[PDB]
Amino acid sequence: EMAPELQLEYMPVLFTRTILGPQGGFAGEERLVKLEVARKYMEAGHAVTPTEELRRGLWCYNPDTDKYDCFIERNEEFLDFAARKRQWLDVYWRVNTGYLLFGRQSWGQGFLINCPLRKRDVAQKLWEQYKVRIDPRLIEFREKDRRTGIQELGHNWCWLYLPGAEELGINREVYDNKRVKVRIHVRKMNSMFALY
């Protein structure tokens, strides 16, 4: 359905190994990846060209023995499960990779903030700069932040609990399959983006 002039810059790719990122995919996915990214994948061995027998079934990377000896039949339910596990791993990677910037007001050169950050604001910035929709109930502040919040100016962090991990089997690859560490950085911005 993609226009031909755009599709010229892509190529169909079957992912042999799960890769996180905007140009990645789960093991056994037919995906239109860009030319350079697909070249990198095929050079690293994490992807192949989608032949018909490969679309029927494909050998995938087995992390237990560190070899590509794990054959997988591409089924409807398998594609559904793999897409869901990929979504879980992807949101974990997004939340755990980078910082979360909060531009707020602070009177003078003080050490604290005027209005402390709450779980609503944390989820707002998550959706804003990570494109992640969550409910604020999953956010847990530190012990020093349970009372007021992220009122401290500078490098902060909190916990983000991700409940559905045991059903997908994400206990091994992730350092902690129950919660994520959300690095937060609050900056005194008196510019137009203060709003507080």
Binding site: S191, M192, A194, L195, Y196
Partner: protein, 150 residues
């Protein structure tokens, strides 16, 4: 009562009443430009604007300096003394376009020449009245002298 409302359906929009609660000049020039587009020049000013996406974007950009109230079309028709069979398009067509500060011109020199052209058109209306009087009198005199000679 547990069923869906029958009969034809009418679409009803909204209008915003925006009030500037802080000094606009204390912020960057871009927020000041957005407030100028909203027609808010000083703290404590109130304007009425449509609910179009442009106005929504302006209000979203200045949402920390203004207080906005919403009134639907029926609510405004009730707030002012206008019947329900009379819309707002006919009232807008009735009200004159020569109301104070008729437009936003790109330059005060353009504003000056617009006022000059208004005065010039008034003077031209009077001159054309007098000249039409003169032309009608001339044609009447011509016809009268022709009918008298004949």
């Amino acid at each position: 009562a547990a069923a869906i409302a029958p009969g034809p359906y009418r679409r009803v929009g909204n209008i915003f009443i925006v009030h500037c609660d802080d000094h606009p000049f204390k912020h960057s020039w871009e927020v000041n430009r957005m407030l100028r587009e909203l027609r808010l020049e000083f703290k404590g000013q109130t304007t009425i604007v449509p609910d179009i996406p442009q106005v929504r974007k302006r209000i979203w950009r200045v949402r920390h300096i203004v207080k906005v109230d919403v009134l639907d079309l029926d609510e405004a028709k009730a707030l002012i003394g206008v019947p329900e069979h009379i819309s707002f398009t006919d009232l807008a067509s009735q009200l004159p376009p020569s109301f104070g500060r008729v437009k936003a011109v790109p330059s005060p020199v353009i504003r000056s020449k617009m006022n000059f052209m208004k005065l010039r058109r008034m003077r031209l209306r009077d001159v054309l009245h007098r000249d039409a009087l003169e032309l009608r009198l001339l044609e009447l005199k011509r016809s009268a002298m022709k009918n008298x000679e004949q």
